[PDB]
Structure 1
């Protein structure tokens, strides 16, 4: 079958593989729509997560179930499904510890294009269908729905880890797709002031749509200075790190109040370490909590985000700046993420 894959670090191309087969609890799905992530880049051209050979890429898909194993009870061929980007093995200690994301090891809950073939093929394999698939209501358009497997769950998890109090001020550092869902997330947790950091025109516009009350552009002076200025030297209650480089940690620590919380949902691809600024961190005694986590996956997560979309609590369609048709265009869409132009938030490819 056709599949667009990371041949080796630095090389990508269309390969051919055996169409996969489902174990008793598994499902085979064909993609209806897919999206590329900057994470696919951080790993192909930067090896942020080690080397690989011939690994079909991509982990954001809505699809149609084409086959299920004999033990699968809730899905059958023909069902339209949202496939979470994280599809954990649900029978592990990590799951008993309440961290399915790390079922089987650090980040191991994230399988597609981390440790198994991704969704950029004619077909793909989902482990444990009943636990890891969600039904797609026909109301919700494909392009919107494909923002759910990853962008929405990551962004919102940023808000969730931040433990936002009603009325509190939040800075979201980065306003790409993830940062934009970070903003929407923070609003849906009751944030008052939300300050987005970024400069892309399309992103600024979307940031305001999602609930940003202020936008800071690096071109107008340093972010910390700008935030301290906006908050009259008081800083903010919460910071969500969604995008940018490792220097954003230091920025987040300098902006946040003592006793506050920093929530990293930014996948850090380069550098050995991240510096925490000693003084601004109260030398380790400022109660400035640093959190950071891979997005939740599985059926329940998807079903919950789907509800939010269904009851119109969030509209992820504004995230999709580019739509193309057909397999051939997965490459185009992939490269668009590598050399991200000024008008890009998230590309989506719709299959026939």
Structure 2
């Protein structure tokens, strides 16, 4: 039979459609959602034709669910189990896994199937490929609002911290304090950073950035970002800069503010432009040892399990990211439009299913 889902129809057009219910392969699971959350990624897919032009493709890639059914080879999950579903759900049997980059298993960024090559999570059911490798059990002591921050927001933000090569006591700059940037701040704290400098203006974000460990807040007003951060560091710069937002020009701010031998760690999706500019002089004319990394978030069962431990054992509380809680399935359209309209008091919305 069929089922209901909130999809993208054409560029700039969304709505509800009705498709045949998904069925699992023997290694797969069919999940029904318990809490979902929309993303800026869904917006660039609709109002910018980012991943190309789809047609009746259900949106959303951050979900916590209850396993509805599992194929015959699924060993560690059974119907009724409550699970965190990672946003990345890669095919784990490729040479790219053997090379150590599961995010690109099968091609560049091919590990991200939800709302891309597959129907997303904004439905009554969705399909998880390789349940034993892409699902993790949700402890009862973690509320659905916090868990639904793990699949994408926590892992991307913590990945920026990881890529930053943060040594103990190093000063970190986080450029952008949306939900991803906020998690990059907590991840920097989770890496032994001393001083953490957050760049942003939204006061709900600025309050949350301090709560996640920021010691300084640089505003887009009050001066230019480069000069402000160099003044705070007394002309020394930062050891690492985690890019978590902006357009291509932020790449030059980060290269200008990190010291020689430091790291620029980007987790931002650059949606437009042919090139991202690296400033030649502040990159030491090519010889300043300022490493630039840019990475898609890790995913999979073990990645979620480790983030679940950080939430369980009280190392990070991702709930303060949730500024809007809706109840009920039909509120997915509301939360989606909230991510497009983006009021000043919004960080991340969550739809809890009845």
Q: Specify if TM > 0.5.
A: yes
Deviations 1:7-49 (A, max 9, x none): 1111111111000000000000000000000111111111222
State the SS of the aligned residue for 1:238.
strand
Which of 132, 136, 139 aligns to 2:138? It is 136
Q: Give the equivalent residue in structure 2 for 1:23.
A: 25
Q: Give the equivalent residue in structure 2 for 1:7.
A: 9
Which of 283, 286, 289 aligns to 1:284? It is 286
Q: Give the equivalent residue in structure 1 for 2:121.
A: 119
Task: Give the deviation of 1:241 after TM superposition.
Answer: 0.3
Task: Give the deviation of 1:283 after TM superposition.
Answer: 1.1
Instruction: State the superposition RMSD in angstroms.
Output: 0.6
Which of 87, 92, 95 aligns to 1:93? It is 95
Q: Give the equivalent residue in structure 1 for 2:58.
A: 56
Q: Give the equivalent residue in structure 2 for 1:330.
A: 332
Task: Give the deviation of 1:53 after TM superposition.
Answer: 1.3
Gaps of 5+ in 1: none
Aligned equivalents of 1:48 and 1:246: distance in 2?
Answer: 16
Aligned equivalents of 1:43 and 1:268: distance in 2?
Answer: 13
Give the alignment of 1:1-352 within 5 angstroms: 1-352=3-354
Contact 1:43 1:269 in 2 (8 A): no
TM-score (norm 1): 0.99
**Which 4+ residue blocks in structure 1 deviate beyond 4 angstroms?**
none
Further displaced range: 3-12 or 74-83: 3-12
State the SS of the aligned residue for 1:16.
strand
Gaps of 5+ in 2: none
